[PDB]
Amino acid sequence: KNVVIYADGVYDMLHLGHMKQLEQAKKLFENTTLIVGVTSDNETKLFKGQVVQTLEERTETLKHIRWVDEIISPCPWVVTPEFLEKYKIDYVAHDDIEDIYAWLKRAGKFKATQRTEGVSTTDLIVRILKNY
Amino acid sequence: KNVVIYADGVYDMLHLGHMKQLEQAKKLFENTTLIVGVTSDNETKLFKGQVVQTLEERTETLKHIRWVDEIISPCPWVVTPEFLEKYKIDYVAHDDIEDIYAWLKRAGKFKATQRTEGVSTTDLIVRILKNY
């Protein structure tokens, strides 16, 4: 009855928005194993942009999050069918936002999870940029 | 066999240092209930200094932390004997750093937990204050 869910991402400066996404993935089915994939520093910088925390720092924080059952760190930048078989993954959970998730959706293996705006560590110091 | 542990604090901009402290408190005994107390905005500002996140924001993040079993939010600024009886608390866990914890230590009810330096959300943007 257990369903293996895979949620990959950068998880830089982990905040409430990330945590709610992990909760959502963890709760997609009654009985789940949530695997979190943490992207490598080099690949994140290459394809996305500057990461603040190292792979080891981003991974260590995730270990403390109630919803996280297993961590693949580092994880591949792009999910492949081979990867899904290797780790026996039933669904990939990711924000949605051509479509790199098209093949997962075609297979019935994609579960959208939603971002929370404004709760980011960026915005909190922008907030604190008012005492002056 | 279950031991009730009470760890109070501000828990502003929760980072790895806080999380490791909560892990330490949670793991003080084999079978524990970890109660986290979150201090009020007004009292924190009064006795400590500016808090970045509201009581509700600081409390909501703690809900996502694996080690947290129960939350008292807001909590009293100062622990009292009456408070320990009300919630059936066996030990208070807090960083140590006259001594407001003297009466707890005298009673056998104090468990020191340790801070982690440098891992704070403050230091991460100080870190990012190098790309320029």
TrEMBL record, chains A, B:
Record: residues binding CMP: 10-11, 18, 95, 116
Parent-protein residues present: 616 to 772 of 896
Domain of life: Eukaryota
Protein name: choline-phosphate cytidylyltransferase
Binding locations of phosphocholine: 10, 48
The organism of origin for this protein: Plasmodium falciparum (isolate 3D7)
Residue ranges of domain Cytidyltransferase-like in the record: 6-125
Family: Belongs to the cytidylyltransferase family.
